[PDB]
Amino acid sequence: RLVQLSRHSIAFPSPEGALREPNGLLALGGDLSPARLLMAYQRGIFPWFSPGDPILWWSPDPRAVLWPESLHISRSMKRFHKRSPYRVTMNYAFGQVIEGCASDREEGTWITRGVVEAYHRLHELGHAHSIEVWREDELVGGMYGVAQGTLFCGESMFSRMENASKTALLVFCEEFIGHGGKLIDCQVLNDHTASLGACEIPRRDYLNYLNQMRLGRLPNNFWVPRCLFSP
């Protein structure tokens, strides 16, 4: 079933044809052009591969996801955030945020220069966005992802100061569900993500939700760079 793409076409096979093991392996090759990525996210597919490997495309089953309103903020964290030392912005510094996610040296190692450029382009073309957590004047955390209507595909988050991540995920969610936001894609469920409320659902249901929310919208100025949380 595994299909190998080419520059000749930006078309992906159907998600349903993905492999079980590894879970979701749908295709390889192609490029990371704005067009190909938009076509991919539009069909519930996303790129993920380690450096040195050809571009690998996925559509796992089940699919990890997170309902905004179902975010789990610990008792200790609400106390922390009630007196948060951070300020949160939107699309003020996409480059630093994804560089942050790339830096750490864990699941962000896949984010190579090539990946960085590709998503930075999407951010400029207006589809990939970032939330920035600030401590004083320095960036200590944040997250970025690709928007798909009222749906948000979370690519990655990073932190250089205690509770910076959660702060972004926390505030983004309030801002998100307050303006029509309906869903966040986590791709594959892990520990940190689970501890935040991420829950699995069937791929078919995810795709069902996907082309249901991609044609929706949020306020015109929702992604306009601005301040999301400042005491």
Ligand X SMILES: N[C@@H](Cc1ccccc1)C(=O)O
Q: Which residues bind ligand X (CB under 6 A)?
A: 143, 145, 154-157, 169, 184, 186-187, 190, 193
Contact partner at residue 186 from ligand X, its own copies, none, CB < 5 to 8 Å by partner kind: ligand X
Q: How far apart are CA 78 and CA 31, in angstroms?
A: 42
Using an 8 Å Cβ cutoff, are 94 and 144 in contact? yes
Q: Does 166 bind its own copies (CB under 8 A)?
A: no
Kindly state the smallest distance separating residue 224's Cβ from its own copies, in Å: 5
Q: Does 48 bind its own copies (CB under 8 A)?
A: no
Other Cβ atoms closer than 10 A to 171:
21
Kindly state the smallest distance separating residue 16's Cβ from its own copies, in Å: 19
Report CA Rg, the chain: 17
Stretch binding its own copies (CB under 8 A), from 16-24, 103-111, 119-127, 154-162: 119-127
**Nearest partner of 131 among 162, 97, 182, 80, judged by Cα:** 97
What's at 131, amino acid-wise?
A: I
Report the residue from 63, 127, 166, 182 that binds its own copies according to the rule CB under 8 A: 127
Kindly state the smallest distance separating residue 142's Cβ from its own copies, in Å: 12
Q: Does 95 bind its own copies (CB under 8 A)?
A: yes
Identify the sign of the CA torsion 152, 202, 204, 120.
positive
Q: Does 208 bind its own copies (CB under 8 A)?
A: no
Helices and strands (H and E) in the chain: how many = 7, 12
Report the residue from 125, 190, 195, 205 that binds its own copies according to the rule CB under 8 A: 125
Contacts of residue 101, defined as CB under 8 A and 6 or more positions apart, other chains included, come to 108, 111, 143, 144, 155, 156, 157, 158
What's at 198, amino acid-wise?
A: A
Kindly state the smallest distance separating residue 214's Cβ from its own copies, in Å: 7
Q: Does 77 bind its own copies (CB under 8 A)?
A: no
What's at 71, amino acid-wise?
A: L
Give me the residues that bind its own copies (CB under 8 A), please: 7-10, 30-31, 33-36, 38-39, 42, 87, 89, 91-96, 123-127, 134, 136-137, 139, 149, 214-217, 220-221, 223-227
